[PDB]
Amino acid sequence: RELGSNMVHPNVICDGCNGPVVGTRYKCSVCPDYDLCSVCEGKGLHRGHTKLAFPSP
Ligand SMILES: [Zn+2]
Ligand SMILES: [Zn+2]
């Protein structure tokens, strides 16, 4: 796998773990305001809605 981005996405909070979103941001494409950090996405949270991957802010 290619070494991903590693920047903080400012003013984005992970709805999974309430942490910062560092690296890729996974924004749900169905929910109006739902995001996962790559750690929570990796854990399989919010499975059932397609998310969009934003590597960088
Ligand atoms: Zn998280
Ligand atoms: Zn959703």
Author numbering: 115 to 171
Quote the study that presented this structure, word for word.
Sequestosome 1 (SQSTM1 or p62) mediates cell proliferation, survival, and death through multiple signaling programs, including autophagy and metabolism. Structurally, p62 contains six functional motifs: an N-terminal PKC-binding PB1 (Phox and Bem1p) domain, the central ZZ and TB modules, a LC3-interacting region (LIR), a Keap1-binding region (KIR), and the C-terminal ubiquitin associated (UBA) domain. Following binding to the ubiquitinated cargos, p62 undergoes oligomerization and delivers the cargo aggregates to the autophagosome via interacting with the autophagosomal membrane protein LC3. Here, we report the structural basis underlying specific recognition of Nt-R substrates by the ZZ domain of p62.
To gain insight into the molecular mechanism by which p62 recognizes Nt-R substrates, we determined the atomic-resolution structure of the p62ZZ-RE complex. We designed and crystallized a chimeric construct containing the Arg-Glu sequence fused via a short linker to the N-terminus of the ZZ domain of p62 (aa 120–171) (hereafter referred to as RE-ZZ). In the structure, two RE-ZZ molecules form a complex in which the RE residues of one molecule are bound by the ZZ domain of another molecule, whereas the linker residues are flexible and have no contact with either ZZ domain. An extensive network of salt bridges and hydrogen bonds stabilizes the p62ZZ-RE complex. The Nt-R is bound in a highly negatively charged groove lined with the residues D129, N132, D147, and D149 of p62. The guanidinium moiety of Arg1 is constrained by a salt bridge with the carboxyl group of D129 and hydrogen bonds with the oxygen atom of the carboxamide group of N132. Notably, the α-amino-terminal NH3+ group of Arg1 is bound via a set of intermolecular contacts, including salt bridges and hydrogen bonds with the carboxyl groups of D129 and D149 and the backbone carbonyl group of I127. In addition, the carbonyl group of Arg1 is hydrogen bonded to the backbone amide of I127. The complex is further stabilized through the interactions involving degron’s Glu2. The side chain carboxyl group of Glu2 forms a salt bridge with the guanidinium moiety of R139, which in turn is restrained through electrostatic and hydrogen bonding contacts with D149, whereas the backbone amide of Glu2 donates a hydrogen bond to the carboxyl group of D147.
